[PDB]
Design a protein around this ligand. Structure first.
Ligand SMILES: Cc1cc2nc3c(=O)[nH]c(=O)nc-3n(C[C@H](O)[C@H](O)[C@H](O)COP(=O)(O)OP(=O)(O)OC[C@H]3O[C@@H](n4cnc5c(N)ncnc54)[C@H](O)[C@@H]3O)c2cc1C
Ligand SMILES: [Cl-]
Ligand SMILES: [Cl-]
Ligand SMILES: [Cl-]
Ligand code: NA
Ligand code: NA
Length: 431
């Protein structure tokens, strides 16, 4: 007879990443026996190639629809109040800025949506250079001519690697089982007459459990057949070094974001500032056969920086990140950029998550579709994956997250354009 919580075993594939580690965290917190939880990943938690594993990330701009609202609020509560996560959230505030008549109009209606969702207390509209420089004087009046902004008091950045590592340490201490590398890289579900009973990894190690969760990020559509519900894309970052004097000047600075430029935020403990641009992402299409598809298909397969650490970023991304520096930090415009790299995410057509049982395999549950904006949900997203496993997922979440092949083009998703492909963007490959 099929089990209580204490007797239920769960494998989390990709449990070294954002959604996976959250899932393992909430299994244990909700009272699964730790030894009954297995975390499998290609790399040790925090996984080298996890989009959530770098020294610092920003919370980022919320999406403006009610499910994302509720998730981001859940997350915010936990980043403020959860003893595990609190210490890694740096509540510097955020400026979401815009320039151009269309962009500013969209920013303003976005602002109104926030007011109308009841976030008026923590968001203010800034309608001049002066009001923006008040919130961050270190911005350049020349550069932000005619900018307007939303300032969010609740915004900030996240010691992301440190957070996932704290989760990993907690899982470890509690007695979660780990397999990494050959013993952690998913190859295929184990199936008994149409029902999933485990997974086999690349090196042929077999694991058995009552539930399997595929939280494999950008790799999810490469591992099992998803009929293009998820299309995986790379974004880019670089770093600049500030002197101790400069770093101290920039300390406690808000996150600054502009959708036409990119973002940056305060330097870390080592006086390093991370800079990103904003763009529709890059695919890397090639032939690959997920499991559960008759035949190899052209799909976007991440080019992993962990597998290929000599990779950088396309020349065009160097140019766009440079432009961001020159706009945000004109006085640093000559600083050398280092540790430029790509991180991989996976887009759904509607940019909502894909968290559902796989129609073909009972007890095989997808938890992916992160759509380039889910790191903020590290604290909370696992709770809802567990809910799904337990049949208790709220209706609206289950709906937003449901299986939905053929329901839109994820290559474009909600971005401004279909992603370009790395094959056509020179300068990242240094083999
Ligand atoms: C530059 C950049 C800026 C971003 N900005 C923001 C932001 O401001 N705010 C925000 O909320 N989000 C942001 N995102 C997105 C955020 O990083 C992701 O949405 C989130 O981290 C993805 O979570 P995930 O668990 O789906 O994937 P990941 O964290 O990448 O985890 C997937 C895991 O699966 C593992 N895996 C892969 N293949 C296998 C296999 N065969 N077997 C076992 N395991 C496997 C991987 O090793 C990895 O650990 C940003 C991302 C990038 C790259
Ligand atoms: Cl932010
Ligand atoms: Cl300076
Ligand atoms: Cl490759
Ligand atoms: Na990293
Ligand atoms: Na200034």
């Amino acid at each position: 007879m099929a089990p209580s919580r204490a007797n239920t075993s769960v494998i989390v594939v990709g449990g070294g990443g954002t959604i996976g580690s959250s899932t393992a965290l909430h299994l244990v917190r909700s009272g699964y026996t730790p030894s009954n939880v297995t975390v499998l990943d290609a790399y040790p938690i925090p996984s080298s190639q996890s989009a959530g594993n770098d020294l610092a990330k920003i919370m980022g701009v919320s999406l403006r629809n009610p499910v994302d609202l509720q998730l981001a609020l859940e997350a915010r509560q936990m980043w403020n109040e959860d003893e595990l996560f609190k210490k890694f959230f740096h509540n510097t505030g955020r400026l979401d800025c815009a320039h151009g008549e269309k962009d500013i109009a969209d920013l303003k209606s976005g602002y109104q949506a926030l007011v109308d969702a009841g976030l008026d207390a923590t968001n203010e509209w800034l309608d001049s250079e002066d009001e923006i420089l008040k919130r961050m004087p270190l911005l350049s009046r020349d550069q932000i001519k005619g900018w307007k902004a939303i300032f969010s008091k609740d915004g900030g950045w996240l010691a992301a690697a440190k957070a996932i590592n704290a989760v990993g340490e907690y899982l470890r201490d509690q007695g979660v089982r780990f397999g990494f590398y050959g013993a952690g890289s998913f190859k295929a579900p184990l199936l008994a007459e149409g029902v999933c009973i485990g997974v086999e990894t690349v090196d042929g190690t077999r694991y058995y459990a009552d539930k399997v969760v595929l939280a494999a990020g950008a790799w999810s559509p490469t591992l099992v057949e998803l009929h293009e519900q998820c299309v995986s894309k790379a974004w880019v970052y670089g770093h600049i070094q500030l002197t101790p004097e400069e770093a101290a000047r920039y300390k406690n600075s808000p996150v600054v974001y502009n959708g036409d430029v990119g973002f940056f935020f305060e330097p870390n403990e080592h006086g390093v500032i991370k800079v990103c641009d904003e763009f529709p992402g890059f695919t890397r299409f090639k032939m690959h056969q997920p499991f559960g598809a008759k035949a190899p298909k052209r799909i976007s397969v991440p080019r992993s920086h962990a597998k290929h650490p000599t990779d950088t970023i396309p020349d065009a991304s160097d140019v766009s990140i440079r432009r961001a520096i020159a706009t945000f930090m004109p006085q640093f415009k000559n600083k050398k950029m280092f540790n430029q790299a790509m991180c991989w995410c996976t887009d759904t057509a509607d940019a909502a998550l894909l968290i559902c049982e796989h129609p073909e395999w009972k007890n095989f549950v997808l938890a992916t579709g992160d759509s380039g904006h889910s790191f903020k949900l590290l604290p909370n997203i696992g709770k809802h994956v567990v809910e799904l496993l337990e049949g208790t997922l709220a209706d609206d979440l289950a709906h937003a997250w449901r299986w939905r092949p053929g329901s839109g083009d994820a290559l474009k998703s909600r971005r401004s354009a279909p992603a370009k492909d790395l094959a056509d963007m020179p300068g990242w490959n240094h083999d």
